[PDB]
């Protein structure tokens, strides 16, 4: 069952964050109400005190306040935050931090960004190859609605397949077809048909001498 998601951020190690489209209006409503509350209780007159693991509000580069979590306090001028509804990280001064009121907590609405990786593909170990794959994904899916299916859990993030909204083409499989990534095989019998399809695309990418396979194998 492929669910609609909005892809927000692509990491340098080929992970990505998504928002669930089904809860997008709930997030927007929370953000409108939180920002109305911030306007009546300006952080400048509030004296929040940032600490690691503590939630906060953080003012992003669009001049709007968002929900965040403090990850590291380097100095008063350098507080490292993670925007819990988007997945991006930022270093900011204390002038751009405030209290997250309980009315807008993750108990009221869960963190809206979830981190995933692509199922059935290996992240390239070579830096330039990895950059090529990340750049392809950023161009094709960053800040777009896609369809997502969770395939398997791992010792890290869950691994998923993504489809383009329009064509319904499998995004990860596209990378394999382009020779941008290698296939990661698994043993589960329910993945055998899809892994078979990915390996077939990989062999065709090798024959076409694309990207990873430009000079042969």
């Amino acid at each position: 069952s492929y669910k609609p998601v909005f892809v927000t951020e692509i990491t340098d190690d080929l992970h990505f964050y998504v928002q669930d489209v089904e809860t997008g209006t709930q997030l927007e409503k929370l953000m409108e109400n939180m920002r109305n509350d911030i306007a009546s209780h300006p952080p400048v007159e509030g004296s929040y005190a940032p600490r690691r693991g503590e939630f906060c509000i953080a003012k992003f580069v669009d001049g709007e306040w968002y929900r965040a979590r403090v990850e590291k306090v380097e100095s008063p001028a350098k507080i490292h935050v993670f925007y819990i509804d988007y997945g991006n990280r930022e270093v900011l001064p204390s002038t751009r931090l405030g209290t997250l009121s309980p009315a807008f907590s993750t108990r009221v609405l869960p963190a809206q960004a979830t981190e995933y990786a692509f199922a059935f593909i290996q992240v390239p170990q070579d830096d330039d190859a990895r950059t090529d794959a990340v750049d392809s994904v950023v161009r094709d899916i960053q800040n777009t609605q896609c369809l997502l299916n969770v395939e398997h859990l791992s010792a890290g993030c869950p691994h998923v397949t993504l489809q383009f909204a329009d064509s319904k083409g499998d995004v990860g499989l596209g990378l394999v077809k382009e020779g941008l990534v290698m296939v990661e095989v698994r043993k589960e019998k329910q993945f055998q048909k899809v892994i078979t399809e990915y390996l077939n695309a990989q062999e065709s990418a090798k024959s076409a001498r694309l990207n990873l396979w430009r000079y042969g194998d």
Partner: peptide, 7 residues
């Protein structure tokens, strides 16, 4: 505004 889901 900021790119985000349009539910």
């Amino acid at each position: 505004g900021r790119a985000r889901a349009r539910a």
